[PDB]
């Protein structure tokens, strides 16, 4: 069983810099991007506004270098990423890009084409 259908609040904003959301947010953004190799494909994906690579292999050896120790390459990489100045609607408008449905979704449920979505279920329990 269970039920619930309550909803929390809404997210963040397609016009807020990535390096503004939340450390728990980097972190469940790590959750999906840190397998896949999901941040590799972010990372590629990020071109310059006139379309140079922004992040070759070059830099993707020193993101490795955070996953082979136990570092997530998704937060340095999003971090990062935020200085470039970019955007929750750039990361989503990539994730959608890259198959990465779900963290895109997880952002901004709207702007990606899927119809999918789902309730996280509910528990303020105390003690």
Request: aromatic share 8%; glycine share 8%.
């Amino acid at each position: 069983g269970s039920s619930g259908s309550s909803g929390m609040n809404k997210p963040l904003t397609p016009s807020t810099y990535i390096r503004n959301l939340n450390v728990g947010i980097l972190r469940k953004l790590s959750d999906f991007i840190d397998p896949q190799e999901g941040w590799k494909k972010l990372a590629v994906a990020i071109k310059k506004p006139s379309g140079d690579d922004r992040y070759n292999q070059f830099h993707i050896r020193r993101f490795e270098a955070l996953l082979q120790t136990g570092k997530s390459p998704t937060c340095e990489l999003l971090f990062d990423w935020g200085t470039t100045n970019c955007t929750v609607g750039d990361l989503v408008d990539l994730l959608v890009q890259i198959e990465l449905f779900a963290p895109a979704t997880l952002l901004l449920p709207d702007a990606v084409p899927q119809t999918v979505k789902s309730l996280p279920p509910s528990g303020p329990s105390s003690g």
